[PDB]
Structure 1
Amino acid sequence: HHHHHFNLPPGNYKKPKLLYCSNGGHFLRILPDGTVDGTRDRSDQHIQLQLSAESVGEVYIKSTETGQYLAMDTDGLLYGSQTPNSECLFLERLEENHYNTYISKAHAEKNWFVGLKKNGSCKRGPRTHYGQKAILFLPLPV
């Protein structure tokens, strides 16, 4: 179980989704240039994400618009990847019996989470921690 709990969020991956971060109320966004951030604008065409599971609890997060996969690099930075690889896998877990969190599988030991600051900028892996609102997401079916 990759040294982590296995409480999982309900639902399925059939329909693409919007990942709403309760921190600043932003939707996770993957820009065409590979940049990742969050925006409050629901009309944005880069927040529709298709999730799919490698194995139970392990997921890929893909922009339906550009086809890029969410990924975190060796230094904890999120980016849009043209090709699905090991940096594109995240351990999708329930948190506080309510939210969805996403731990980079490649850096699961250090608990590096996908997260958005209140200003809508992405947090760097090492700066995320259990207990922050930055790592809490609420998925919305498109």
Structure 2
Amino acid sequence: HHHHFNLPPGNYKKPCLLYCSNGGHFLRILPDGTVDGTRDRSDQHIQLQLSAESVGEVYIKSTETGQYLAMDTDGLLYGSQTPNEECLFLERLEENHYNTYISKKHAEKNWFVGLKKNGSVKRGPRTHYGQKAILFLPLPV
């Protein structure tokens, strides 16, 4: 147990967009497996469906392509065709308001899903508690 257990209130009944308040980008998983952010709300690759594997553990998947968000051994986000250990994230409340996603596989190192102000994904080792890059708000589709 390397992290707290304050959980966000939402549910997974419907798909969502994951809005990063850092630069205001929506998390995007492209068909080729590339992950980045875009401010275009009409983009067809920003609609995501979360699901819970265990309480507080989730998969984040592209509704358009079926790919799972995953963080590799060097901290890079990618789209995975099949669910594996790199696809599980610890979903937690942060600052009594936002959702954060910590790589379960690399939880001891505090590697988060995060977007920089320019829309590029932040590599896991570059993320850490206290940054704006790691703060997301799940919006309806």
Instruction: Name the TM-score, length of structure 2 as normaliser.
Output: 0.99
The match for 2:104 is: 105
Residue-by-residue CA offset, 1:10-46 (whole Å, 9 max, x unaligned): 0100100000000000000000000000000000000
The match for 2:75 is: 76
**Matched residue pairs, number?**
141
The match for 2:90 is: 91
**What do you get for the CA RMSD once the two structures are aligned?**
0.4
SS at the partner of 1:87? Answer: helix
- The 4+ residue runs of structure 1 with deviation greater than 2 A are none
Q: How many angstroms apart in 1 are the aligned matches of 2:38 and 2:120?
A: 9
Q: How many angstroms apart in 2 are the aligned matches of 1:19 and 1:8?
A: 16
SS at the partner of 1:45? Answer: coil
Q: How many angstroms apart in 1 are the aligned matches of 2:10 and 2:33?
A: 28
Q: How many angstroms apart in 2 are the aligned matches of 1:83 and 1:109?
A: 24
SS at the partner of 1:134? Answer: coil
Q: How many angstroms apart in 2 are the aligned matches of 1:135 and 1:84?
A: 22
Q: How many angstroms apart in 2 are the aligned matches of 1:113 and 1:129?
A: 7
Q: How many angstroms apart in 2 are the aligned matches of 1:77 and 1:139?
A: 22
Shift of 1:141: 1.6
The match for 1:50 is: 49
Shift of 1:3: 1.9
The match for 1:140 is: 139
Q: How many angstroms apart in 2 are the aligned matches of 1:28 and 1:138?
A: 11
Residue-by-residue CA offset, 1:95-130 (whole Å, 9 max, x unaligned): 000100000000000000000000000000000011
Task: State the percentage of identical aligned residues.
Answer: 97
Unaligned runs of 5+ in 2: none
SS at the partner of 2:121? Answer: coil
SS at the partner of 1:91? Answer: strand
Shift of 1:62: 0.2
Instruction: Name the TM-score, length of structure 1 as normaliser.
Output: 0.98
